[PDB]
Structure 1
Amino acid sequence: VHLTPEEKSAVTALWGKVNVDEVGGEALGRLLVVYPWTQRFFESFGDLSTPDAVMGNPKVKAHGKKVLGAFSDGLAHLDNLKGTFATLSELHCDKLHVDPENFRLLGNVLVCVLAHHFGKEFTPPVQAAYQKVVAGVANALAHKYH
């Protein structure tokens, strides 16, 4: 990951205005609505089967807060990406075998909702800067697959 200072300023200042519950609801929503393999967890979300169901689901917004709160633990501690996420890499295998292909998609999808929500500010490097942290996050959850 290790972004350049101007890239870091761009991603972390877009984070600084980010609506973590609604960008998270819409990141996790955006992923869930392709009907991909993550729809197998629709039963823990309790609503996903329609657009209005997933976009308004308090459990997709709340889980959105957890995935993106960890993504922020990334932007606070990019010197880790091996210890800050390790309990998550454990959860996301030793209790949830759920394939890290799913994490790559959530990651990719996250950059997209940020560019929806801040489309006047979505610069070519800010989205890539996001993707560098995100590819780190997917690789970090995948670390336990050594």
Structure 2
Amino acid sequence: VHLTPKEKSAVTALWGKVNVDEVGGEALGRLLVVYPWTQRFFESFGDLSTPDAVMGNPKVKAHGKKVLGAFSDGLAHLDNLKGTFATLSELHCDKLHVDPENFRLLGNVLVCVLAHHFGKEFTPPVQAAYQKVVAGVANALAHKYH
């Protein structure tokens, strides 16, 4: 993927404002609520019986923080997503066997969460920049599948 400088600027400036303790858990929790088959991978997380239980589940919030960290790492290496996500690809593809369509879904949930938090500041060009990013991360995470 290739972001223009304008896009890179827009992405980095928004990301600096992201709450790193909460946004990842919100994206992961929404993934589990909106696409419930994904819960199959989180049996050990306990109570996922209702949307409120999912969103407030300490393990969802904690795990979501790790997810967001990887996106942050991706953001720092837009020109080497593949090496950045190498071990995570082995994990998600070879060990967990997550269908890679779900990487696309989680990236798009993250985009919805950014829109939710930033409102009008999440303009159409800002979204377009973030779509390049989340596509790039999804493609890199799926590398062990192709």
Same fold (TM over 0.5): yes
1:132 to partner: Cα distance: 0.6
Q: Is the 8 A contact 1:37 1:102 kept in 2?
A: no
Deviations 1:5-25 (Å, cap 9, x if unpaired)? Answer: 111111111110101221111
Which stretch shows the higher mean deviation, 40-49 or 117-126?
Answer: 40-49
> How many pairs are equivalent?
146
**TM-aligned CA deviation for residue 36 of structure 1:** 3.0
Query: Deviations 1:24-77 (Å, cap 9, x if unpaired)?
Result: 111111111124321212313323221211111111111111111111111101
List runs of 5+ in structure 2 lacking aligned partners. Answer: none
| Alignment RMSD (CA, Å) | 1.2
Cα offsets for 1:93-130 (capped at 9, x unmatched): 22111111111100011000011011131110111211
Structure 1 segments unaligned to the other structure (5+ residues):
none
1:20–1:64 Cα contact (<8 Å) kept: no
TM-score, normalised with respect to structure 1: 0.94
TM-score (ref. length: structure 2): 0.94
Separation in structure 1 between the aligned mates of residue 45 and residue 125 of structure 2, nearest angstrom:
33
